[PDB]
Coordinates of all heavy atoms in Angstrom, one line a residue:
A54 N -0.7 12.9 3.0 CA -1.8 12.2 2.4 C -1.5 10.6 2.5 O -0.4 10.2 2.7 CB -1.9 12.5 0.9
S55 N -2.6 9.9 2.6 CA -2.6 8.3 2.4 C -3.2 8.0 1.1 O -4.1 8.7 0.6 CB -3.3 7.7 3.6 OG -4.7 7.7 3.3
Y56 N -2.6 7.0 0.4 CA -3.0 6.5 -0.8 C -2.6 5.0 -0.9 O -1.4 4.7 -0.7 CB -2.4 7.3 -2.1 CG -2.8 6.7 -3.3 CD1 -4.1 6.4 -3.6 CD2 -1.9 6.4 -4.4 CE1 -4.5 5.9 -4.9 CE2 -2.2 5.9 -5.5 CZ -3.5 5.6 -5.8 OH -3.8 5.1 -7.1
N57 N -3.6 4.0 -1.0 CA -3.4 2.5 -1.2 C -2.6 2.1 0.1 O -1.5 1.5 -0.1 CB -2.6 2.1 -2.4 CG -3.5 2.2 -3.6 OD1 -4.6 2.1 -3.5 ND2 -2.9 2.4 -4.9
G58 N -3.0 2.6 1.3 CA -2.3 2.2 2.5 C -0.9 2.8 2.8 O -0.3 2.4 3.7
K59 N -0.4 3.7 1.9 CA 0.9 4.3 2.1 C 0.6 5.9 2.4 O -0.3 6.4 1.8 CB 1.8 4.0 1.0 CG 3.3 4.2 1.3 CD 4.2 4.0 0.1 CE 5.6 4.4 0.4 NZ 6.4 4.3 -0.8
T60 N 1.6 6.4 3.1 CA 1.5 7.9 3.5 C 2.6 8.6 2.6 O 3.7 8.1 2.5 CB 1.7 8.1 5.0 OG1 2.9 7.4 5.3 CG2 0.5 7.4 5.7
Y61 N 2.3 9.8 2.2 CA 3.2 10.7 1.5 C 3.2 12.0 2.1 O 2.1 12.4 2.6 CB 2.6 10.8 0.0 CG 2.6 9.4 -0.7 CD1 1.6 8.7 -0.5 CD2 3.8 8.9 -1.4 CE1 1.4 7.4 -1.1 CE2 3.6 7.8 -2.1 CZ 2.5 6.9 -1.9 OH 2.4 5.7 -2.5
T62 N 4.2 12.7 2.0 CA 4.4 14.2 2.5 C 4.4 15.0 1.2 O 5.1 14.7 0.3 CB 5.7 14.4 3.3 OG1 5.7 13.5 4.4 CG2 5.9 15.8 3.7
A63 N 3.6 16.1 1.3 CA 3.5 17.0 0.1 C 4.8 17.9 0.0 O 5.4 18.1 0.9 CB 2.3 17.9 0.3
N64 N 5.1 18.1 -1.3 CA 6.2 19.0 -1.7 C 5.6 20.4 -2.0 O 4.5 20.5 -2.5 CB 7.0 18.4 -2.8 CG 7.6 17.0 -2.4 OD1 8.3 16.9 -1.4 ND2 7.4 16.0 -3.1
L65 N 6.5 21.4 -1.7 CA 5.9 22.8 -2.0 C 7.0 23.4 -2.9 O 8.1 23.0 -2.8 CB 5.9 23.7 -0.7 CG 5.0 22.9 0.4 CD1 5.1 23.7 1.6 CD2 3.5 22.8 -0.1
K66 N 6.5 24.3 -3.9 CA 7.4 25.0 -5.0 C 8.5 25.8 -4.2 O 9.6 25.8 -4.8 CB 6.5 25.7 -6.0 CG 7.3 25.9 -7.3 CD 6.6 27.0 -8.2 CE 5.3 26.5 -8.8 NZ 5.6 25.6 -9.9
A67 N 8.1 26.5 -3.1 CA 9.0 27.4 -2.4 C 9.3 26.9 -1.0 O 8.3 26.5 -0.4 CB 8.4 28.7 -2.4
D68 N 10.5 27.0 -0.6 CA 11.0 26.9 0.8 C 10.3 27.9 1.7 O 10.2 27.6 2.9 CB 12.5 26.8 0.9 CG 13.1 25.6 1.6 OD1 13.0 24.4 1.1 OD2 13.5 25.8 2.8
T69 N 10.2 29.1 1.1 CA 9.7 30.4 1.9 C 8.4 30.9 1.1 O 8.4 30.8 -0.1 CB 10.8 31.3 2.0 OG1 11.1 31.8 0.7 CG2 12.1 30.8 2.7
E70 N 7.6 31.6 1.8 CA 6.5 32.4 1.0 C 5.7 31.4 0.2 O 5.4 31.7 -0.9 CB 7.3 33.4 0.2 CG 6.5 34.8 0.2 CD 7.3 35.9 -0.5 OE1 8.6 35.9 -0.4 OE2 6.7 36.8 -1.1
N71 N 5.4 30.2 0.7 CA 4.7 29.2 0.0 C 3.2 29.3 0.4 O 2.4 28.4 -0.1 CB 5.3 27.8 0.2 CG 5.4 27.3 1.7 OD1 4.4 27.7 2.4 ND2 6.7 26.9 2.0
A72 N 2.8 30.2 1.3 CA 1.5 30.2 1.9 C 1.2 31.6 2.3 O 2.1 32.4 2.5 CB 1.4 29.3 3.1
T73 N -0.1 31.9 2.6 CA -0.6 33.2 3.0 C -1.6 33.0 4.1 O -2.3 32.0 4.0 CB -1.2 34.0 1.7 OG1 -2.2 33.1 1.2 CG2 -0.1 34.2 0.7
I74 N -1.7 33.9 5.0 CA -2.6 33.9 6.2 C -3.5 35.1 6.0 O -3.0 36.3 5.7 CB -1.8 34.0 7.5 CG1 -0.6 33.2 7.4 CG2 -2.8 33.7 8.6 CD1 0.3 33.4 8.6
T75 N -4.8 34.9 6.2 CA -5.8 36.0 6.3 C -6.7 35.7 7.5 O -7.0 34.5 7.8 CB -6.6 36.2 5.1 OG1 -7.4 35.0 4.8 CG2 -5.7 36.5 3.9
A76 N -7.1 36.8 8.2 CA -8.2 36.6 9.2 C -9.5 36.3 8.5 O -9.6 36.7 7.4 CB -8.3 38.0 10.0
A77 N -10.3 35.5 9.1 CA -11.7 35.2 8.7 C -12.4 36.5 8.4 O -12.3 37.5 9.1 CB -12.4 34.4 9.7
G78 N -13.2 36.5 7.2 CA -13.9 37.6 6.8 C -13.1 38.8 6.4 O -13.5 40.0 6.7
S79 N -11.8 38.6 6.0 CA -10.8 39.7 5.6 C -10.0 39.1 4.5 O -9.8 37.9 4.5 CB -10.0 40.2 6.9 OG -8.9 41.1 6.3
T80 N -9.4 40.0 3.7 CA -8.6 39.6 2.5 C -7.1 40.2 2.7 O -6.3 39.8 1.8 CB -9.2 40.1 1.2 OG1 -9.3 41.5 1.2 CG2 -10.6 39.5 1.0
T81 N -6.9 41.0 3.8 CA -5.5 41.5 4.1 C -4.6 40.3 4.5 O -5.1 39.5 5.3 CB -5.6 42.5 5.3 OG1 -6.9 43.2 5.2 CG2 -4.5 43.4 5.3
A82 N -3.4 40.3 4.0 CA -2.4 39.3 4.3 C -1.7 39.7 5.8 O -1.5 40.9 6.0 CB -1.2 39.4 3.3
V83 N -1.6 38.7 6.6 CA -1.1 38.8 8.0 C 0.3 38.2 8.0 O 0.4 37.1 7.5 CB -2.1 37.9 8.9 CG1 -1.6 37.9 10.4 CG2 -3.4 38.6 8.8
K84 N 1.2 38.9 8.5 CA 2.6 38.3 8.7 C 2.6 37.4 9.8 O 1.8 37.6 10.8 CB 3.7 39.5 9.0 CG 4.1 40.2 7.7 CD 5.5 40.2 7.3 CE 6.3 41.2 8.0 NZ 5.9 42.6 7.7
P85 N 3.2 36.1 9.7 CA 3.3 35.2 10.9 C 3.8 35.8 12.1 O 3.3 35.3 13.2 CB 4.3 34.1 10.3 CG 5.0 34.8 9.2 CD 4.0 35.8 8.6
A86 N 4.6 36.8 12.0 CA 5.1 37.6 13.2 C 4.0 38.3 14.0 O 4.2 38.4 15.2 CB 6.2 38.5 12.7
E87 N 3.0 38.6 13.3 CA 1.8 39.4 13.9 C 0.6 38.6 14.3 O -0.3 39.2 14.6 CB 1.5 40.6 12.9 CG 2.6 41.3 12.5 CD 2.6 42.5 11.6 OE1 1.4 42.8 11.2 OE2 3.6 43.2 11.2
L88 N 0.7 37.3 14.2 CA -0.4 36.4 14.6 C -0.8 36.7 16.1 O 0.0 36.9 16.9 CB 0.0 34.9 14.5 CG 0.2 34.4 13.1 CD1 0.7 33.0 13.0 CD2 -1.2 34.6 12.3

């Protein structure tokens, strides 16, 4: 992100499993291995 001319990197609560992938028009979770 940029704020008042400076850039910041976002922090996440988890080093792993901090995100989920779904195909468009689907709610099933996709493993990154199966992209």
Side-chain angles (χ1 to χ4, degrees):
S55 80
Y56 177 51
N57 287 334
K59 203 179 166 188
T60 59
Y61 301 86
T62 301
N64 300 304
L65 308 175
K66 200 195 286 285
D68 228 76
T69 67
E70 218 169 332
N71 55 42
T73 57
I74 318 169
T75 65
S79 171
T80 62
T81 330
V83 175
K84 283 237 277 295
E87 307 184 358
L88 290 175

